[PDB]
């Protein structure tokens, strides 16, 4: 199973 | 009381201060963040055995069972035959041997089981030959996993992972299903790919029973220096339904490509994409989709790049459209368009601006005209102002040049003929004056104030015969109340109508003793001194009226409280002998969860005849205009049910336009949603009546594993006439 | 009657000088807010000025949605409704922040065989919506001076 979320800049 | 509070009543808090010193207490047992309690302890030097009613608690878990063991130097631990309960997080379960390893990071469970359900409320559980909870990767790993609902296993695999926090992870998402009249049973199985912090994908096979094949839905999302965007590629290798309605064709593939991007970079470079393309006209009527809709007559294909700074901007763009209807196959595109603006304030008392455009117009048909157009528009204005009023004066030049090509076919069909080279130059003059009166209200309440705001505007634009320019980009604009003060009758540059008119209007506003605006009402009219002409004035109206007070519009807004709002507007046109369009809405909204909205939309049969394609006045599906009543509501029943619903009704047809009904039950341990929609989805030409599609959709979710927590606001936007908040 | 000419300015006298802060200073909302503030006689200062005595208007999220608002008897769009929402905040120096918002509604008829013309009409409408959002934020400024005085009393 997996889990999605908001994108963010590395780091 | 609220659901987050009901779920927290089943979740341990931490009773001690967050934190080394060590304490042992006994008859001659309680030991100390981490605490151990037992009837008996034996200590050796470093290790302990613990026995009888062994209880252990900590900053993240309670453990309980018959027997304990630990190494005090490494904080490694074994509890046999026990059960466990997470602290500040919802999970609990059993194991034949529960182990702490890697200085509290790894919690291992031999013959383990796990659930987010509160004690005794045992709805679902995982079972495995081994489970590992890892606190740094936010994951439970399970070997020989069985997933149980009640006592019965629904599923098995040799290995499984659950994510047990809010950190992203690749793998399958929970599936969903629906039943539709269009495809029968349908099933979706998303796989999520976590590529990087700033980009991800989802691959979703979408089975449709009627078609006997899987559509592959591929989503990609990204965040970048240039902006953020989303791409979607949906592909179906063949279609047994399509291959019967289009039986002679080479292949029955169906596909959709979508890309959207927006961004501003280094504060000056602007990037936008708004691109949709589909295999055939029928795509959005067959396939329910996140981006297109059965409501849509074309797909839009746009790109733009712009440079913008405080006093200057330049934008290059393309605008292409894929039109679904068979009724006309022609479609104009801008390929490219360049826009430029330059600003300079305080040029003496005057403010100055220049607008420039270059555009090339291309058509899908080989026989349609093509053009290049160049436009230049210097403007000078003199603003004057007071506490109680203002007056603005503008002058412009509307200089335009066309080169027109491919005219032979069009000039064979028409007596008015297009010209290969056209110059149009027009001076525009405008004067626009406002006042503001105030009055103390003795009548409504103490400290209230009423404002009265009269406007008047004069506009002069001279006549130029434009019938030798083809209309590539000029739609007739809708004259709403703010629209009474436009300098343009049309939306582009191919028609500029002569103007010799005074607009007059008045607004009144009511302000409370906190100086908040409670209410406003606006009324205005346009009085025309000469007929507004383009030389291509082939529009059709009920009356031969040309001059006088032809257009009226009004608008009101009442903010009755912080929960109640009333909006409405009306347009009346004397050339239609009738109200052209109207809309109104009343809303009550207490929460995201709790709202009711009633709305009404009117557009007359005469307005359709005057402003839309000429066959709309003949086709029964368009001919009668709009007279639509809508009701939208969301309410919670108990703290655990959300009921959402919308009904929309055509008052001329006495037929439903749209109806949606959504029920979500929300436990601490899981949620379920059922959603129904019935929509107008086309027309039957052989029988002369509307076609309806029904969909029933089933979504299911686990809870307590993540921060994700009554489904109301998502359901309210699932239908063809989606909710907008009007407070 | 009881009616008289408005005695005060549209902008509070304590907001005659102010700092306009935005994440998109060159964008279309920023231009409409610059334009209304200057038209009301406000003199704006740069974000990094030494003038820490003057208030700031801080422009935030803009959203534009376009939704089908009406359908013809075959379920095709008759009307689109466009809704613009603008969130902003005003900081009075050494005192609290006051959040404000504007909401603008516009609608237009679609036309599948003048689709490019209708896209130009949508660009036309969105430009006008930023002027209405800019007017609405400036009409909310007197309420902030009232909330300020009420927090003092």
Method: cryo-EM
Sign of CA dihedral B231, B235, B241, B242: positive
Beta-strand pair C56-71/C17-21: parallel
Alpha-carbon distance of B324 to B390, in angstroms, equals 49
∠ Cα B676 B722 B255 (to 5°): 75
Picking from B192, B195, B203, B702 by the largest number of A CB atoms within 10 A of its own CB, the best residue to mutate is B192
Length of chain B: 727
CA dihedral B17, B22, B26, B31 (to 10 degrees): 50
A1 and B173 within 8 Å at the Cβ level: the answer is: yes
Name the residue facing B601 among C72, C79, C118 (closest C-beta). Answer: C79
User: Distance of CA B161 to CAs A3, B488, B668, B699, Å?
Assistant: 11, 62, 21, 21
The pair of three-digit structure tokens given for residue B657, joined into one six-digit string = 């336009």
Closest residue in C to B437 (Cα–Cα): C5
Question: Left (φ > 0), alpha (ψ -120 to 50) or beta: where does C94 sit?
Answer: left
Residue C8 forms part of a structural domain: no
Name the residue facing C75 among B319, B478, B679 (closest C-beta). Answer: B679
CATH assignment of the domain containing C26: 3.30.160.150
B198 and A5 within 8 Å at the Cβ level: the answer is: no
Residues in B closer than 8 angstroms to C72, CB to CB, are 621-622, 626
Alpha-carbon distance of C141 to B212, in angstroms, equals 62
The pair of three-digit structure tokens given for residue C125, joined into one six-digit string = 């409408």
Name the residue facing A4 among B160, B168, B199 (closest C-beta). Answer: B168
The pair of three-digit structure tokens given for residue B692, joined into one six-digit string = 């309806």
Alpha-carbon distance of C26 to C58, in angstroms, equals 14
3-state SS record for B561-625: CCCEEEEEEEEEECCCCEEEEEEEEEEEECCCCCEEEEEEEEECHHHHHHHCCHHHHCCCCCCCC
Name the residue facing B223 among A2, A4, A7 (closest C-beta). Answer: A7
My answer on whether omega of the bond before B539 falls inside 30° of 0, hence cis, is no
Picking from B159, B200, B263 by the largest number of A CB atoms within 10 A of its own CB, the best residue to mutate is B200
Q: Is A1 on the interface with B (CB under 8 A)?
A: yes
Distance linking the first and last C-alpha atoms of chain B:
27
Beta-strand pair B595-603/B626-637: antiparallel
| Tally: H helices and E strands in chain B | 6, 45
The pair of three-digit structure tokens given for residue B120, joined into one six-digit string = 């005794």
Residue C77 forms part of a structural domain: yes
Rg (chain B; Cα; Å): 34
Residue C120 forms part of a structural domain: yes
C142 and B515 within 8 Å at the Cβ level: the answer is: yes
The pair of three-digit structure tokens given for residue B134, joined into one six-digit string = 């890892």
Say if CB C19 and CB C92 are below 8 A apart. no
Sign of CA dihedral B590, B592, B596, B599: positive
Residue C34 forms part of a structural domain: yes
Say if CB B632 and CB B595 are below 8 A apart. yes
Residue C123 forms part of a structural domain: yes
Look up the domain containing C126 and give its range.
Answer: 13-152
Phi and psi (nearest 5°) for B443? -105, -45
Name the residue facing B310 among C26, C73, C142 (closest C-beta). Answer: C26
Residue C121 CA, chain-centre distance (Å), reads 21
Contacts 24+ apart (CB under 8 A), B310-319: B310/C25, B310/C26, B311/B342, B311/B343, B311/B344, B312/B340, B312/B341, B312/B342, B312/B343, B313/B339, B313/B340, B313/B341, B313/C26, B314/B338, B314/B339, B314/B340, B314/B341, B315/B270, B315/B339, B315/B340, B319/C116, B319/C119
CA dihedral B477, B479, B480, B486 (to 10 degrees): 80
Residue whose entry in the numeric block shows the structure tokens 């006309």: B328
The pair of three-digit structure tokens given for residue B719, joined into one six-digit string = 């239908």
Grouping H, G, I as helix, E, B as strand and the rest as coil, residue A4 is coil
The DSSP annotation for B65-92 comes to: EEEEEEETTTTEEEEEEEEEEESSS--E
Alpha-carbon distance of B359 to B479, in angstroms, equals 27
Q: Identify the helix (H) or strand (E) that includes residue B162.
A: strand B152-163
Length of chain C: 153
Q: Identify the helix (H) or strand (E) that includes residue C79.
A: strand C77-91
Say if CB C40 and CB C138 are below 8 A apart. yes
C113 and B313 within 8 Å at the Cβ level: the answer is: no
Q: Is B194 on the interface with A (CB under 8 A)?
A: yes
CATH superfamily, region B3-167: Lipopolysaccharide (LPS) transport protein A like domain (2.60.450.10)
Q: What are chain B's partners, defined as 3 or more CB pairs within 8 angstroms? A: A, C
How many domains are contained in chain C? 1
Say if CB B122 and CB B91 are below 8 A apart. no
Alpha-carbon distance of B115 to B148, in angstroms, equals 10
| Contact flag for C and A (3+ C-beta pairs < 8 Å) | no
Residue C6 forms part of a structural domain: no
B192 and A9 within 8 Å at the Cβ level: the answer is: no
Alpha-carbon distance of B50 to B58, in angstroms, equals 16
Please name which of B197, B195, B190, B237 lies closest in space to residue B218, comparing C-alpha atoms.
B190
Picking from B328, B449, B491 by the largest number of C CB atoms within 10 A of its own CB, the best residue to mutate is B491
3-state SS record for B493-517: CCCCCCEEEEEEEEEEEEECCCCCE
Please name which of B373, B402, B530 lies closest in space to residue B462, comparing C-alpha atoms.
B530
Residue C4 forms part of a structural domain: no
CA dihedral B117, B118, B123, B126 (to 10 degrees): 40
Say if CB B338 and CB B357 are below 8 A apart. yes
Q: Where are chain B's structural domains? A: 3-167
B197 and A3 within 8 Å at the Cβ level: the answer is: no
Grouping H, G, I as helix, E, B as strand and the rest as coil, residue C95 is coil
B223 and A8 within 8 Å at the Cβ level: the answer is: yes
Alpha-carbon distance of B519 to B505, in angstroms, equals 17
The half-sphere exposure of A10 on its side-chain side, counting CA atoms within 13 A, is 6
Q: What are chain A's partners, defined as 3 or more CB pairs within 8 angstroms? A: B
How many C-beta atoms lie closer than 10 Å to residue B378's C-beta? Answer: 15
B169 and A10 within 8 Å at the Cβ level: the answer is: no
Please name which of B420, B415, B437, B419 lies closest in space to residue B506, comparing C-alpha atoms.
B437
């Amino acid at each position: 199973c997996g889990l999605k979320g908001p994108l963010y800049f590395p780091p | 009381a609220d659901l987050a509070s009901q779920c927290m009543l089943g979740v341990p808090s931490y009773d001690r201060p967050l934190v080394l010193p060590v304490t042992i207490n006994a008859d001659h047992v309680d030991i100390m963040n981490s605490r151990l309690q037992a009837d008996e302890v034996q200590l050796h030097q470093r290790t302990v055995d613990a026995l009888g009613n062994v209880h252990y608690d900590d900053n993240q878990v309670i453990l309980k069972g018959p027997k304990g063991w630990a190494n005090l130097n490494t904080k490694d631990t074994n509890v046999w035959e026990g059960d466990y309960q997470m602290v500040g997080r919802q999970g609990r379960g059993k194991a034949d041997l529960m182990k702490q390893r890697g200085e509290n990071r790894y919690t291992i469970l031999d013959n383990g089981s796990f659930t987010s359900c509160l004690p005794g409320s045992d709805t679902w559980s995982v079972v495995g030959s081994e489970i590992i909870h890892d606190r740094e990767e936010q994951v439970a790993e399970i070997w020989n996993a069985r997933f149980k609902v009640g006592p019965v296993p629904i599923f098995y695999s040799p290995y499984l992972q659950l994510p047990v926090g809010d950190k992203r992870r690749s793998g399958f998402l929970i599936p969903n299903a629906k039943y539709t009249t269009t495809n029968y049973f349908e099933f979706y199985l998303p796989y999520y790919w976590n590529i990087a912090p700033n980009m991800d994908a989802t691959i979703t096979p979408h089975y449709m029973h009627r078609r006997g094949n899987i559509m592959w839905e591929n989503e990609f999302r990204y965040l970048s220096q240039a902006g953020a965007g989303l791409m979607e590629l949906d592909y179906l290798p063949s279609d047994k339904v399509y291959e019967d309605e289009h039986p002679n064709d080479d292949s029955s593939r169906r596909w959709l490509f979508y890309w959207n991007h927006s961004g501003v970079m280094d504060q000056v470079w602007r990037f936008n994409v708004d691109y949709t393309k589909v295999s055939d006209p029928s795509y959005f009527n067959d396939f329910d989709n996140k981006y297109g809709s059965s409501t849509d007559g074309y797909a839009t294909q746009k790109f733009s790049v712009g440079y913008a700074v405080q006093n200057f901007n330049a934008t290059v763009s393309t605008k292409q459209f894929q039109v679904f209807s068979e009724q006309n196959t022609s479609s104009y595109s801008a390929e490219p368009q360049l826009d430029v603006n330059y600003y300079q304030n305080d040029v003496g008392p005057f403010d100055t601006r220049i607008y420039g455009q270059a555009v090339h117009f291309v058509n899908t048909r080989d026989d349609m005209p093509e053009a290049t157009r160049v436009h230049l528009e210097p403007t000078i204005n003199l603003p004057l102002s007071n506490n109680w009023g203002s007056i603005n004066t503008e002058a412009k030049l509307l200089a335009t040049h066309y080169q027109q090509t491919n005219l032979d076919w069009y000039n064979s069909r028409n007596t008015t003929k297009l010209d290969e080279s056209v110059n149009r130059v027009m001076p525009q003059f405008k004067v626009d004056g406002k006042m503001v009166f105030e009055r103390d209200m003795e009548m409504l309440a103490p400290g209230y104030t009423q404002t009265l705001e009269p406007r008047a505007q004069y506009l002069y634009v001279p006549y130029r015969d434009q019938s030798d320019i083809y209309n590539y980009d000029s739609s007739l604009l809708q004259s709403d109340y703010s629209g009474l003060f436009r300098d343009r009758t049309y939306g582009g540059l191919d028609r500029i109508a002569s103007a010799n008119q005074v607009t007059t209007g008045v607004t009144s506003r009511i302000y409370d003793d906190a100086a908040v605006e409670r209410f406003n009402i606006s009324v205005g009219q346009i009085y025309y001194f000469t007929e507004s002409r383009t030389g291509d004035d082939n529009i059709t109206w009920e009356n031969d009226d040309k001059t006088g007070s032809l257009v009226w519009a009004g608008d009101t807004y009442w903010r009755i409280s912080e929960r109640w709002g009333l909006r409405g507007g009306i347009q009346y046109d004397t050339r239609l002998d009738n109200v052209a369009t109207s809309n109104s809405s009343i809303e009550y909204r207490r929460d995201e969860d709790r709202l009711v909205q009633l709305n009404y939309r009117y557009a007359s049969p005469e307005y359709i005849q005057a402003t839309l394609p000429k066959y709309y006045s003949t086709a029964e599906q368009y001919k009668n205009g709009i007279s639509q009543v809508g009701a939208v509501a969301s309410w919670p029943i108990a703290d655990r049910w959300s009921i959402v619903g919308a009904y929309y009704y055509d008052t001329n047809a006495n037929k439903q336009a749209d109806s949606m009904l959504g029920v979500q039950y929300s436990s601490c341990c899981y949620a379920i949603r059922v959603g129904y929609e019935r929509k107008l989805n086309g027309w039957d030409n052989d029988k002369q009546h509307a076609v309806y599609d029904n969909a029933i959709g089933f979504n299911i979710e686990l809870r307590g594993l993540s921060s994700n927590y009554l489904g109301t606001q998502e359901m309210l936007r699932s239908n063809i006439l989606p909710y907008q908040n009007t407070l | 009657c009881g009616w008289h000419l408005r005695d005060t300015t549209q902008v509070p006298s304590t907001m005659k000088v102010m700092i306009l802060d935005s994440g998109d200073p060159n964008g279309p909302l920023s231009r409409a807010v610059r334009n209304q503030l200057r038209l009301n006689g406000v003199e704006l200062l740069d974000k990094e000025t030494t003038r820490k005595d003057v208030p700031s208007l801080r422009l935030g999220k803009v959203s534009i949605a376009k939704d089908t608002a009406s359908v013809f008897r075959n379920g095709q769009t008759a009307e689109y409704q466009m809704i613009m929402t603008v969130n902003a905040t005003v900081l009075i120096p050494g005192r609290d922040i006051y959040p404000i918002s504007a909401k603008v509604f516009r609608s237009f008829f679609d036309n599948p065989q003048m689709a490019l013309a209708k896209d130009n009409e949508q660009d036309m409408i969105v430009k006008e919506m930023y002027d209405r959002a800019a007017e609405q934020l400036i009409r909310k400024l007197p309420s902030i001076r009232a909330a300020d005085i009420r927090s003092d009393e």
